[PDB]
A paper describes a structure:
The best crystals were obtained with 7.8 MAG at 20°C. These yielded three crystal forms in space groups C2, P212121, P21 that diffracted to 1.9, 2.4 and 2.8 Å resolution, respectively. In contrast, the asymmetric units of [name]-2.4 and [name]-2.8 contain two molecules (molecules A and B). For all in meso structures, type I packing was observed, as is the norm for crystals grown in a lipidic mesophase environment. Interestingly, we find that L2 and T8, while ordered in some crystal forms, are disordered in others. Disorder, where electron density is either not observed or is ill-defined in the map, suggests that the corresponding loops, or parts thereof, are flexible and, in certain cases, may have relocated to reside outside the barrel. In the case of [name]-2.4, which has two molecules in the asymmetric unit, T8 is disordered in molecule A ([name]-2.4A) and is ordered in molecule B ([name]-2.4B). These two crystal forms are interpreted as examples of the alginate pore in which its periplasmic gate (P-­gate) is open and closed, respectively. It appears therefore that in this collection of six models we have an ensemble of structures that map a conformational landscape for alginate transport. We refer to this as the double-gate model.
Author numbering: 39 to 105, 116 to 440, 454 to 490
The structure:
Amino acid sequence: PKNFGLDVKITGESENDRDLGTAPGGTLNDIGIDLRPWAFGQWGDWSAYFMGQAVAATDTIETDTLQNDGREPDKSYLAAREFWVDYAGLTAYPGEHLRFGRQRLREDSGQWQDTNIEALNWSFETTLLNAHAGVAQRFSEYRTDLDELAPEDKDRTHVFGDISTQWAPHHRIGVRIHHADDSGHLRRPGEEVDNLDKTYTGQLTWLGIEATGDAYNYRSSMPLNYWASATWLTGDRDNLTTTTVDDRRIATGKQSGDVNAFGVDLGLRWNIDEQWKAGVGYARGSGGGKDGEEQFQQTGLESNRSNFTGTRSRVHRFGEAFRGELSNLQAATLFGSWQLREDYDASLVYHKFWRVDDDSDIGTSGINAALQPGEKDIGQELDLVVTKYFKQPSALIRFRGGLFKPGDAYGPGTDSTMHRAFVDFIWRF
Ligand SMILES: CCCCCCC/C=C\CCCCCC(=O)OC[C@H](O)CO
Ligand SMILES: CCCCCCC/C=C\CCCCCC(=O)OC[C@H](O)CO
Ligand SMILES: CCCCCCCCCCCC[N+](C)(C)[O-]
Ligand SMILES: [Cu+2]
Ligand SMILES: [Cu+2]
Ligand SMILES: [Mg+2]
């Protein structure tokens, strides 16, 4: 058991243009280094881990796919990524352990949780039955450049769980729950409201079923793989109301409404042979409705990145460029993928996006530009991921790129094309 190491990453990012040319900046053409020293110890059923991070870049690029004066990042910073203790001795099951601290929370779809966060998480993974249960909350960014949490994350508590069984070899059915609460943390009327304050609070519960047949298993022995999930979002959100007096904003009350939304994601992958795969996907997050109540949203812990193309490399489920969130969004996707032993892989993904309700914004982490009322046609995207794995979890060099072609929903004076591309070189010592 290796007690220390150092992960070294060099990243280049090209982005143009996040705002489709409508606002200033929003593009990237830059390079950076990301150094992650780590430490690990193990003593019987216990273990503990720390990973820190030092980054220096020519601009504020994304070196980690998992991510106000207080919220402007610096080109360079130090951070604590993970720090936890783990106990695996409750049961003899090796996939069963309890982890406490800032840790990687992930499920295979990436659509519920895929992030580093302070948490207490119990995992129970066996051949016939998988289960998890945990609680999480952000208390800090643990970063030298960020002094404060984003208001949405502040005092927001997450509680979640899942259970599933393998009813035949490689065919799984399960349910999953997540609840996020930050209710009652709004400014009471009379108080001054800063840029650091919340504009809303919520109590939200996601309830999902999910069936998978080696959905995210790149080494599947089956000729066909699939995923299917349906997720119900319910609860309510209180919207903070304000007024401005003498150049100072101030709380006046709140406006409340129920949330009642629904999301679905379906996919089918043909394992043509040991190297070639192809597939189709469909996903939809409901949108709009009375006071946004039919507006699906995700937990806020998601990456939407997964091995859905059937390779070791994870790919953004809704485009490297568009980076859609499943929110008032319909997407149809087509992909093919290729790999050669453990040395290389590659994926080509096409997406088409539509709005569900043409008078509501969509779910997006990649494009910052206003939509035209009454237009459903968000656009199309083509993505390519290519990776080489070196002999010395493994060193790699990877290209990740997305080309997005905005549809009629973005309208006049917007660029006809936008891209976001990365090259990452990663070496482990
Ligand atoms: C269904 C689309 C799958 C992706 C197709 C586009 C792939 C584009 C470039 C792949 C480049 C991979 C190069 C791997 C390589 O250099 O192999 C060297 C020898 O051929 C084997 O060692
Ligand atoms: C500025 C570097 C940009 C790199 C972009 C990511 C490319 C990722 C994989 C492409 C691999 C192409 C070269 C493959 C290679 O090095 O072959 C070496 C083998 O020993 C030949 O069999
Ligand atoms: C080289 C290992 C890096 C570990 C150091 C991580 C420190 C980041 C947290 C310190 C607090 C930063 N803050 C909140 C004051 O801005
Ligand atoms: Cu711009
Ligand atoms: Cu098997
Ligand atoms: Mg155990």
